[PDB]
């Protein structure tokens, strides 16, 4: 229908009023902007002059009626927090919003037996009124008809679930910065959306009042500085830091030498003019890196100046420190998609759902008055539209994966424009993919640039155990990677300094023997370390300390470690070596930003130690290699060895499907238990690896050869155990299996003690395994190892958040939790006084 | 097979006035035999065959009497498979006549043939593995 | 439960879990079921010098999750650090 | 604005929009009614006269609305009454069913996989050729065991003994398709040298060019809304106004012998109940006129395949073309005044008795 848009008349004798009318309003009542002009017929060449007094106020009053549902008051402080009203996310608003922006993602569509999400773009709908109210105060004086939206950005708070239908969302907005630039005033606004008291997401909006502004007393800028890192190598570096008043340790006598410091500073500035600051504040924590790579606060930056040309804190940290960059670029960007989209023919649908009733998008006359090329598309429509493409292509239409999105509004878009968006994977940040996009119009002009942070697919890290080690493992990575170098070098130094051997030397050269010499002062210190290496057992409430390395006394000049083939196969060296290769690989991944913040993890046997150091940083490199060296020595002591370092113990991988299709894991359990009882030798199923395809039997090399021969015989005879025990005879199968075991046991006992285990039909021996790992044979080792673990795993390094729900232990194959149920299940598996005491007394720990 | 039945049809198409006796046998026939079911390929091809009036459709393999051939003559055989009736134009009898008086088969070979129990159509494919009804599949040169 | 008390109990639980792991069987059947089924993991990254656990996950999936993975249309990548560096580091061939 | 689209092919929306059921449902009605009118007018019949020559009518899925509509028709004056009722039923089915289950973007990884494995662009209806209903029902049972209730697939159309259609979420059917692509042997596999019973079953599966899961639990919420819209817009079908039998697509019963609302039953047959095509086509006829859309790809040729050798001739009433095999007719056969108009298809029981 046809409505009045402009009314031009004489208000008074000399005052021309051009009333610009907006008909598309909040309540349906038209809103009028009275533009006033003096008519002075004495100046015939230019008789009309604009009334510039209160002109920005008149424009703001219009925009207030269109945008804000409050009483018109421009007298509020741009420093104060803006409180937006609570917003309930309804299915109807999500429907309307998603249709308006062309977001066809299923997460936002009502489906049976399933909760409807809101897109993160919906944050601008919830937060618009709070956010936009920031550009209105009297002291932020600008012409809203010349307002440019420079940039918008969303950031999900880590842990926060996406917005849902039903959610009551509260919004706060603060002006981060308002600064006078040569070409206009920039206003940087930060909105925080919260739900149930907890913050969900931050909306960042940058607005530009085009104009000439010189009101520097109303300007201010808050910057979150990049994190700066200093490695304090010398006492000169320490003196240079102590010369800075702003450098303020909590403990003045703190030892900075060899420490890595991180400075997490924020700079608050107020302006006197364009170039000179009237005030500088630079403040924030100074953190030292601990051996676990955790950072803890040891002091503050606290710099405060009046009139200044610069921030000396940040200048110092730039010159002397290194910048820690969270974003890590891939070797080469990975093209994802080149996608066509269209801006709608009309901006009224987006205007209605967004609450952005800015006349320039809908009313030809305002767009003309504002000198625009027409009724331009909402920048926020193009944002939501390109974000829907990212979500579809980069996130494979799993909306939850999109954790951040920023867009720069480079150039204006007209309705019925064909936009081409190039999307690329360019890097990683904290396990999230970093997607760059560039939207061009039909004229190949860049209209929109930005980036998104997309969660990787749900990931599990699994850490291999013993058997997997080979000479040279991790040594390619050690050459190339600084992260891997730091892991190996720290461990190699600890081993050289403490035990007089290089774990790197053993990995690279795999020597058959290694002699440690105890000569000189350094040698006596290393000998002490070997002697001070003790089993700490409690027998009848008495500490009975035993010695590993009995042959090492105060008169020993050397100690030789012995192996048949190479020491990388001896478990006291295998364990550290594997643990380091895994931790070095993982630290390289972490350096490249490849580790999802919520990844799950498990390690197979030894793997559990690397997994815990890697994903949870429970132990330092030094603690780690020490713990697994000891663990390996505990296992070596438990097993008798010959002159060449060979034991009478081993492991076989048994495939119950390779003997007979009817031969189940209960049949294998039965057979193995019977071969154990008959011979009296050690054999147990210890690793459950692949259901009905891979079970590992550990124990006596003779018992393992007997089991191999029994299963070889059962396969060749094609005779079932479960069919006979149920359908033919009761307990006769037991007696029948005894003579089959005896046939194999007689041939096994004759063979010499270091007998080479042979590859059966259903059995393969594990190469480079000499200990019966995970058998009851090692149960005596538990108490001393427990006491050693209690000393070397410090409770301050156990971060429950890094374990809870993420770590799957080998013992209790259930995700780690600190619950009575978890403790009770651990107690049922392995009865322990400390755990039983925790279960019984659980109530006092809760309060 | 299907492909060979298609080739017979192509020959019938090319000589529409010349009578073609399409003698269909399944793998269950005596002598050199296919891997084919007796029924399935007829169910698939019967319509296309019957578009060529010069094709006289003969069913063989597995037959030895009026009783077992009658359903193929009336077409009721195809009804067990939820198809419309599919009558055939005639029958061939290979194995059935091997113990006739005038066949040169030696007396003891006739006794050997007679003593073969045979199996129903559902079991014939066991000949590929082991003796089935006294009969087995072996490979020619 | 207070953060520092939870930390103390977590320390005791972790020390006990590792101590007994020494001389208890490795329940890697149940572990694979927890991370393949209860978490519907899409990327299994094996950190090790050889593909032993990758091989095990690839066989567990083929043996008991072939219909599950089809029905829920979830694509598993089983990556070993030692072979699949290009897939883990996102460095594909030009 | 269909008149605009027909005048100017440039101003016609894209195929995806045309295919959406709020447009496709009523417009497929219009195509069928248009073919019925072209047929009646070129024979110089009234709609009722052409109707009176019919032993019966039925339709496959939404065709059943057009079948009841033409069953009510008498004169050219009152024909637009029947047209309105049909267009109105199909409008509300299209609109309500779309609102109950709108199509959403499918993950591009799923689209890329389906295209690289020479399957269709996924859709809410998957056609499986050369498997039995039991076999298909076994594979949907396996898929449905893992899936939750709102994502479960179901056999929607039993078009033939080995011609089935499964309805449900396109992603759920892509899931079924992954299970099927393991069980299916390659197309160019030679199994001639394998014993018959040991051969790997070979079959076809393609997504249908449709945009809604007809005959599925997904559309059941729309039922009550369609019924209320029909009582509001005064659309009913009375048994006494229906002059020929119209066969139910579920049990093949005459709709005229229903106790309850015929409009409610017809809606139920389209949105919820499966189409048992061989059950509904149990009628005895020498000739079947296929008005529906698709010409040689339509319901006529499907029905021919099911009825081959029973002495039924299908005529595709909507398409002028030449059949080289001449096993079914086109438009020209309806109007031909010579002997070429009365072609009978062979009944094998009678011809080779
Ligand atoms: C056992 C193991 C070596 C098998 O992995 P692999 O070398 O990749 O073996 P594969 O099964 O892929 O096949 C290699 C060949 O080895 C042989 N083989 C493998 N498993 C076998 C078994 N259980 N019995 C007999 N032969 C076997 C076969 O000849 C096989 O060839 P095939 O595939 O034709 O059968 C490996 O999985 C492993 O190291 N697992 C044990 C891990 C463990 O528990 N160690 C920790 C100790 S605390
Ligand atoms: C002893 C013997 C020998 C032959 C055959 C069969 C038998 C039994 N058959 C196949 C034969 O013509 C016919 O196709 C089958 O015998 C039909 O199956 P039944 O044997 O009746 O079940 C056969 N076919 C053919 O074309 N030329 C031949 O030389 C032979 N040889």
UniProtKB/Swiss-Prot annotation, chain B:
<protein>
    <recommendedName>
        <fullName>Fatty acid synthase subunit beta</fullName>
    </recommendedName>
</protein>
<comment type="subunit">
    <text>[Alpha(6)beta(6)] hexamers of two multifunctional subunits (alpha and beta).</text>
</comment>
<comment type="function">
    <text>Fatty acid synthetase catalyzes the formation of long-chain fatty acids from acetyl-CoA, malonyl-CoA and NADPH. The beta subunit contains domains for: [acyl-carrier-protein] acetyltransferase and malonyltransferase, S-acyl fatty acid synthase thioesterase, enoyl-[acyl-carrier-protein] reductase, and 3-hydroxypalmitoyl-[acyl-carrier-protein] dehydratase.</text>
</comment>
<comment type="similarity">
    <text>Belongs to the fungal fatty acid synthetase subunit beta family.</text>
</comment>
<feature type="modified residue" description="Phosphothreonine">
    <location>
        <position position="25"/>
    </location>
</feature>
Swiss-Prot record, chain C:
<comment type="subunit">
    <text>[Alpha(6)beta(6)] hexamers of two multifunctional subunits (alpha and beta).</text>
</comment>
<comment type="similarity">
    <text>Belongs to the thiolase-like superfamily. Fungal fatty acid synthetase subunit alpha family.</text>
</comment>
<comment type="function">
    <text>Fatty acid synthetase catalyzes the formation of long-chain fatty acids from acetyl-CoA, malonyl-CoA and NADPH. The alpha subunit contains domains for: acyl carrier protein, 3-oxoacyl-[acyl-carrier-protein] reductase, and 3-oxoacyl-[acyl-carrier-protein] synthase. This subunit coordinates the binding of the six beta subunits to the enzyme complex.</text>
</comment>
<protein>
    <recommendedName>
        <fullName>Fatty acid synthase subunit alpha</fullName>
    </recommendedName>
</protein>
<feature type="modified residue" description="Phosphoserine">
    <location>
        <position position="50"/>
    </location>
</feature>
<feature type="cross-link" description="Glycyl lysine isopeptide (Lys-Gly) (interchain with G-Cter in ubiquitin)">
    <location>
        <position position="37"/>
    </location>
</feature>
């Amino acid at each position: 229908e046809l409505k009045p848009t402009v009314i031009l008349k004489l208000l008074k004798e000399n005052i021309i009023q051009m009333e610009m009318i907006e008909n598309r309003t909040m309540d349906g009542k038209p809103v009028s902007l009275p533009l006033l002009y003096n008519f002075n017929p004495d100046n015939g060449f230019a008789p009309i002059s604009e009334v510039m007094e209160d002109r920005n106020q008149r424009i703001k009053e219009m925009y207030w009626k269109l945008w804000i549902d409050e009483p018109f008051n421009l007298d509020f402080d741009p420093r104060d927090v803006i409180k937006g009203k609570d917003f309930e996310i309804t299915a109807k608003e999500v429907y309307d919003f998603t249709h308006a922006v062309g977001n066809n993602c299923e997460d936002f569509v009502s489906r049976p037996d399933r909760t409807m999400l809101a897109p993160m773009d919906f944050a601008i709908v919830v937060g618009w009124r709070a956010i936009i109210k920031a550009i209105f105060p009297n002291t932020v004086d600008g012409d809203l008809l010349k307002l440019v939206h420079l940039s918008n950005g969303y950031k999900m708070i880590p842990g926060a679930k996406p917005l849902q239908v039903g959610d009551v969302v509260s919004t706060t907005a603060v002006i981060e910065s308002v600064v006078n630039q040569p070409t206009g005033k920039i206003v940087d606004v930060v909105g925080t959306l919260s739900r149930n008291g907890k913050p969900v997401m931050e909306v960042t909006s940058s607005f530009f009042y085009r104009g000439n502004y010189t009101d520097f007393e109303n300007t201010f800028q808050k910057t979150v500085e990049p994190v700066y890192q200093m490695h304090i190598k010398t006492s000169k570096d320490i003196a240079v830091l102590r010369s800075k008043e702003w450098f303020q340790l909590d403990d003045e006598d703190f030892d900075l030498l060899n420490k890595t410091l991180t400075f997490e500073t924020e700079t608050e500035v107020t302006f006197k003019n364009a170039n000179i600051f009237s005030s500088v504040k630079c403040f924030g924590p100074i953190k030292v890196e601990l051996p676990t790579k955790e950072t803890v606060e040891i002091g503050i930056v606290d710099y405060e100046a009046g009139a200044s040309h610069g921030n000396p804190v940040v200048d110092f940290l730039k010159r002397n420190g290194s910048t820690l960059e969270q974003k890590v670029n891939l070797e080469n960007p990975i093209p994802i998609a080149v996608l066509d989209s269209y801006t709608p023919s009309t901006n009224e649908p987006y205007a209605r759902v967004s609450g952005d009733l800015n006349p320039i998008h809908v009313s030809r006359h305002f767009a003309s008055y504002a000198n625009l090329p027409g009724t331009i598309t909402h920048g926020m429509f193009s944002s939501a539209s390109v974000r829907a493409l990212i979500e579809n292509w980069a996130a494979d239409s799993v909306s939850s994966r999109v954790r951040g999105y920023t867009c720069q509004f480079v150039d204006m878009v007209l309705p019925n424009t064909a936009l081409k968006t190039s999307i690329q994977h360019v890097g990683m940040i904290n396990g999230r993919k970093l997607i760059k996009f560039e939207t061009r119009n039909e004229d190949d002009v860049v209209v929109l640039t930005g980036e998104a942070e997309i969660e990787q697919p749900v990931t599990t890290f699994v850490f291999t155990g013993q058997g997997s080690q080979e000479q040279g493992m991790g040594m390619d990575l050690y050459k190339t990677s600084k992260a891997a170098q730091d892991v190996w070098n720290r461990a190699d130094n600890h081993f050289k300094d403490t035990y007089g051997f290089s774990i790197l030397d053993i990995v690279i050269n795999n020597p058959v023997n290694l002699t440690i010499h105890f000569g000189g002062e350094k040698g006596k210190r290393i000998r002490e370390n070997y002697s001070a290496m003790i089993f700490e057992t409690i027998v009848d409430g008495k500490l009975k300390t035993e010695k590993i390395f009995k042959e090492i006394n105060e008169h020993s000049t050397s100690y030789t470690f012995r192996s048949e083939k190479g020491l990388l196969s001896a478990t006291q060296f295998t364990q550290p070596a594997l643990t380091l290769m895994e931790k070095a690989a993982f630290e390289d991944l972490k350096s490249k930003g490849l580790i999802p913040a919520d990844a799950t993890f498990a390690g197979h046997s030894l793997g559990e130690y690397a997994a815990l150091a890697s994903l949870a940083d429970v132990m330092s490199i030094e603690s780690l290699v020490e713990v697994v060296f000891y663990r390996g020595m505990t296992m070596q002591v438990a097993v008798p060895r010959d002159e060449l370092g060979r034991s009478n113990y081993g492991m076989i991988a048994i495939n119950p499907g390779r003997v007979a299709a009817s031969f189940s894991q209960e049949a294998l359990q039965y057979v193995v238990e019977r071969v154990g009882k008959r011979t009296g030798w050690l054999v147990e199923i210890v690793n459950y690896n692949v259901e009905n395809q891979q079970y590992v039997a550990a124990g006596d090399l003779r018992a393992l050869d007997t089991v191999t021969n029994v299963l070889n015989f059962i396969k060749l005879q094609k005779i079932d155990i479960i069919e006979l025990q149920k359908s033919l005879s009761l307990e006769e199968v037991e007696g029948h299996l005894f003579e089959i075991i005896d046939e194999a046991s007689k041939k096994s006992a004759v063979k010499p003690r270091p007998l080479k285990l042979e590859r059966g039909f259903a059995c393969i021996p594990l190469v480079g395994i000499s200990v019966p790992f995970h058998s009851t044979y090692l149960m005596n080792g538990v108490k001393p190892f427990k006491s050693f673990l209690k000393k070397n795993i410090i409770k301050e390094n156990v971060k429950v958040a890094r374990l809870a729900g993420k770590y799957i232990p080998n013992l209790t194959a259930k995700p780690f939790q600190v619950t009575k149920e978890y403790f009770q299940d651990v107690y049922d598996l392995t009865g322990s006084e400390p755990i039983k005491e925790i279960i019984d007394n659980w109530e006092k720990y809760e309060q | 097979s299907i492909d060979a039945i298609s080739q017979v049809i192509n020959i019938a198409k090319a000589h529409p006035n010349f009578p073609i006796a399409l003698q269909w046998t399944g793998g269950r026939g005596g002598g050199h035999h296919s891997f084919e079911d007796a029924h399935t390929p007829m169910l698939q091809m019967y319509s296309k065959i019957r578009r060529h009036p010069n094709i006289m459709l003969i069913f063989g393999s597995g037959f030895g009497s009026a009783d077992d051939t009658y359903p193929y003559l009336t077409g009721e055989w195809s009804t067990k498979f939820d198809y419309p009736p599919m009558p055939f134009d005639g029958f061939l009898f290979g194995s059935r006549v091997m113990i006739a008086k005038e066949v040169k088969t030696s007396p003891d070979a006739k006794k050997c043939i007679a003593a073969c129990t045979g199996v129903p159509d559902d079991k014939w494919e066991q000949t590929y593995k082991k003796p089935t009804g006294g009969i087995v599949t072996v490979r020619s040169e | 439960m207070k953060p520092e008390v939870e930390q103390e109990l977590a320390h005791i639980l972790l020390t006990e879990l590792l101590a007994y792991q020494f001389a208890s069987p490795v329940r890697w059947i149940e572990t694979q079921d927890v991370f393949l089924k209860d978490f519907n993991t899409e990327r299994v990254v094996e950190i090790g010098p050889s593909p032993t656990l990758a091989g095990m996950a690839q066989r567990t999936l083929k043996n008991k999750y072939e219909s599950y993975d089809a029905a829920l249309s979830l694509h598993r990548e089983i990556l070993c650090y030692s072979k699949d560096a290009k897939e883990i580091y996102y460095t594909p061939d030009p | 604005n269909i008149l605009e689209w027909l005048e100017n092919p440039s101003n016609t929306p894209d195929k995806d929009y045309l295919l959406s059921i709020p447009i496709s449902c009523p417009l497929i009605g219009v195509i069928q009614l248009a073919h019925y009118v072209v047929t009646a007018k070129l024979l110089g019949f009234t709609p009722g006269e052409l109707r009176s020559y019919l032993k019966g009518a039925t339709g496959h899925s939404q065709g059943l609305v057009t079948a009841v509509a033409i069953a009510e028709t008498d004169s050219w004056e009152s024909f637009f009454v029947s047209v309105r009722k049909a267009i109105t039923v199909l409008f509300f089915i299209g609109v309500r069913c779309y609102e109950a289950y709108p199509n959403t973007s499918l993950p591009p990884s799923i689209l890329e996989d389906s295209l690289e494995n020479n399957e269709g662009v996924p859709s809410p209806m998957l056609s499986i050729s050369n498997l039995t209903q039991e076999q298909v029902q076994d594979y949907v049972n396996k898929t449905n065991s893992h899936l939750p209730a709102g994502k479960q697939v179901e056999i929607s159309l039993v078009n033939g003994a080995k011609n089935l259609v499964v309805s449900g979420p396109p992603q759920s059917l892509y899931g079924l398709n992954l299970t099927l692509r393991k069980a299916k042997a390659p197309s160019g596999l030679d199994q001639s040298r394998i014993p018959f019973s040991e051969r790997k079953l070979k079959f076809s599966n393609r997504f249908l060019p449709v945009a809604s899961p007809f005959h599925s639990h997904l559309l059941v919420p729309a039922s009550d809304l369609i019924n209320k819209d029909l009582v509001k817009n005064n659309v009913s079908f009375n048994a006494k106004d229906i002059q020929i039998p119209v066969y139910d697509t579920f049990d093949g019963s005459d709709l005229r012998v229903l106790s309850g609302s015929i409009s409610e039953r017809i809606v139920d047959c389209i949105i919820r109940l499966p189409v048992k095509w061989e059950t509904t086509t149990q009628f005895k006829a020498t000739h079947i006129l296929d008005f529906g859309p698709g010409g040689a790809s339509g319901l006529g040729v499907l029905t021919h395949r099911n009825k081959d050798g029973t002495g039924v001739r299908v005529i595709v009433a909507g398409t002028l073309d030449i059949n080289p095999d001449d096993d079914y007719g086109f438009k020209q056969e309806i109007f031909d005044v010579t002997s070429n108009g009365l072609k009978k298809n062979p009944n094998w029981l009678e011809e080779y008795h």
